[PDB]
RNA sequence: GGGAACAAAGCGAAGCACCC
């Protein structure tokens, strides 16, 4: 996260860290959507152009964390993965269209002060809140600067930034990459003066909105891609969770 | 499900608000 | 009118080929 700040304790209790067993390293963000389902970006798990193709046994999820690196005794919980499901039309070749994946945990996590699932939006909630000019919130342990080896550009603790949703034609004109109806973008315009963006390391993390209708937090987006981080005239791109909710539900209804 | 989703034990459940959620709520004032 | 359309191909402060 570029130009964000330190999260408060328990601010984002649905935040999940995806962690490589060997070498031991942070891979990506993710989000907790029930006691045994975790949502993330497909490119965190499968991206052949970088020879990336993880299996269940390559990975842990770490839930309830605040520090990037410290083992948080009696706070964080670690789960193994039972199965990974990649969206069947995930387009890694072109533009990361449908950059979304589900991971089923081997056993359920217990909820706590620091661990709690986020809501997924119904049609009315999505139609109401997913509007240009409305702000949501992005969280992650990814890079602090566009320019992961470099320890000055790695956060000590979870980072948070609030960002406005951007009109679709502005998103489209900002980049030569093809934007699909399964994406949206967010970020301040250069004329708005304020700054902030997701960055490398933040993929899979949630873009969330607090509903003014029932005071609940909904995940509208998954950090998916960009070009550099926090450049004037560039915006972060996010997988459109509501648009692919039928798939999410299909997997969960079918696979236990 | 998901019964009790989206309500943070250390914030909504204690009627406490985090430092920047007001910025999100104010962004609804207009639109759209 | 209803279902489906694993939001598939498409179409702006994005909200509109299969079966009955
Ligand atoms: C995997 C995630 O950590 C990361 C998120 C980057 C978010 N950046 C901003 N500014 N919000 N995603 C990536 O690194 C993805 C995966 C593959 C390449 N990629 C990119 O973002 C490229 N920089 C651009 C791109 C190339 C090919 C296809 C789509 C986008
Ligand atoms: C990913 O890994 C599995 C083996 O674990 C392999 O069968 C599959 O074809 C791989 N997919 C790609 C696209 O590399
Ligand atoms: Ca920007
Ligand atoms: Mg489509």
């Amino acid at each position: 996260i570029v130009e964000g700040s330190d999260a408060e304790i328990g601010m984002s209790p649905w935040q999940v860290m995806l962690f490589r067993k060997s070498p031991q390293e942070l891979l990506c963000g993710a989000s907790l959507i029930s006691d045994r389902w975790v949502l993330t970006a497909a490119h965190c798990l499968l991206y052949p152009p970088w020879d990336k193709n993880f299996t269940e046994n390559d990975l842990l999820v770490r839930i309830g964390k605040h520090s990037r690196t410290r083992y948080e005794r009696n706070i964080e919980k670690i789960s193994m993965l039972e199965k990974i499901y990649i969206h069947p039309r995930y387009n890694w070749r072109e533009n990361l269209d449908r950059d979304i994946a589900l991971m089923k945990l081997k056993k359920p996590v217990a909820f706590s002060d620091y661990i709690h699932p986020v809501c997924l939006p119904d049609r009315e909630t999505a139609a109401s809140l997913l509007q240009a000019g409305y702000k949501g919130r992005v969280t992650g342990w990814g890079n602090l600067k566009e320019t992961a080896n470099v320890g000055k550009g790695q956060p000590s603790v979870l980072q948070v930034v609030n960002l406005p949703i951007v009109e679709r034609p502005v998103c489209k004109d900002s980049t030569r990459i093809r934007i699909t109806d399964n994406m949206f973008c967010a970020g301040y315009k250069p004329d708005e003066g304020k700054r902030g963006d997701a960055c490398e390391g933040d993929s899979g993390g949630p873009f969330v909105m607090k509903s003014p209708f029932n005071n609940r937090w909904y995940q509208m987006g998954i950090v998916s891609w960009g070009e550099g981080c926090d450049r004037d005239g560039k915006y972060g791109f996010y997988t459109h969770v509501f648009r692919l909710k039928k798939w999410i539900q299909k997997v969960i209804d079918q696979f236990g | 499900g998901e019964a009790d989703c989206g309500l943070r034990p250390l914030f909504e459940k204690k009627s406490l608000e985090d430092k920047t959620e007001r910025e999100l709520l104010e962004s609804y004032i207009d639109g759209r």
Side-chain angles (χ1 to χ4, degrees), chain A, chain B residues 1-21 23-24 26-32:
Chain A
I1 304 289
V2 187
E3 288 292 311
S5 58
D6 290 359
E8 297 162 67
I9 297 301
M11 191 188 213
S12 181
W14 34 85
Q15 197 77 25
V16 178
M17 176 188 303
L18 192 64
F19 199 83
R20 205 209 218 284
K21 290 197 176 177
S22 164
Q24 298 264 110
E25 69 190 7
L26 190 150
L27 296 173
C28 262
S31 58
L32 217 227
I33 65 175
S34 74
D35 71 345
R36 70 208 56 184
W37 289 99
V38 171
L39 196 58
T40 194
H43 88 253
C44 296
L45 302 170
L46 179 64
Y47 193 66
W50 290 349
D51 288 309
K52 184 196 294 289
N53 182 0
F54 289 117
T55 74
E56 289 72 358
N57 339 53
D58 299 325
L59 311 161
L60 304 175
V61 298
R62 307 176 59 176
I63 312 174
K65 295 190 61 40
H66 182 64
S67 174
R68 187 172 56 83
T69 64
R70 191 174 78 75
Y71 178 66
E72 285 160 310
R73 193 169 69 255
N74 303 313
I75 305 297
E76 82 176 273
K77 300 295 169 182
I78 307 194
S79 322
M80 300 166 48
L81 314 186
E82 196 208 283
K83 196 156 174 48
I84 290 157
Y85 307 80
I86 307 302
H87 188 95
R89 297 186 197 257
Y90 163 57
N91 191 342
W92 57 260
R93 286 167 187 291
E94 190 198 346
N95 60 353
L96 305 185
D97 192 25
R98 315 171 191 92
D99 194 8
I100 189 166
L102 282 164
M103 300 173 293
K104 188 155 162 57
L105 303 190
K106 261 226 161 83
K107 56 161 173 163
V109 256
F111 301 155
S112 76
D113 283 353
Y114 308 101
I115 299 178
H116 196 90
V118 67
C119 307
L120 303 180
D122 58 78
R123 188 167 36 68
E124 287 184 0
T125 298
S128 290
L129 266 25
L130 207 53
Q131 291 295 328
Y134 290 1
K135 295 181 178 172
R137 177 181 282 171
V138 185
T139 40
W141 287 277
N143 302 338
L144 261 10
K145 299 267 73 108
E146 173 190 315
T147 294
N149 295 282
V150 181
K152 296 144 67 188
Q154 291 312 102
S156 172
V157 300
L158 183 68
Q159 300 289 295
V160 59
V161 69
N162 299 330
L163 263 13
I165 294 154
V166 169
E167 292 83 358
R168 301 191 63 76
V170 174
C171 299
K172 289 176 185 191
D173 295 341
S174 65
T175 183
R176 299 167 65 82
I177 296 160
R178 185 183 61 96
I179 307 315
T180 76
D181 299 351
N182 301 306
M183 308 175 178
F184 67 90
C185 94
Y188 291 101
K189 288 154 193 195
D191 28 293
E192 289 173 313
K194 299 170 191 207
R195 299 208 77 77
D197 194 2
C199 201
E200 277 79 33
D202 291 317
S203 295
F207 178 100
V208 301
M209 299 191 75
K210 191 169 172 172
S211 172
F213 307 118
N214 64 7
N215 300 340
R216 289 186 188 240
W217 290 92
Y218 287 84
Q219 177 170 2
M220 314 307 304
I222 301 159
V223 176
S224 175
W225 67 266
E227 298 167 285
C229 300
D230 195 42
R231 292 178 189 170
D232 291 345
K234 292 303 214 182
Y235 305 87
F237 284 74
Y238 299 79
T239 308
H240 197 309
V241 170
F242 176 70
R243 274 300 184 109
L244 305 179
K245 204 193 176 186
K246 185 176 279 178
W247 180 73
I248 295 165
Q249 263 297 316
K250 190 178 214 168
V251 170
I252 289 171
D253 287 351
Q254 174 166 154
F255 287 100
Chain B
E2 187 76 19
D4 188 40
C5 66
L7 295 177
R8 303 170 290 174
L10 263 18
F11 293 92
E12 286 77 18
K13 293 200 171 182
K14 291 182 148 184
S15 301
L16 296 174
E17 61 182 61
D18 72 51
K19 288 159 184 207
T20 66
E21 58 176 275
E23 170 178 16
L24 300 185
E26 293 163 348
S27 78
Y28 305 133
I29 308 314
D30 198 42
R32 266 102 122 71

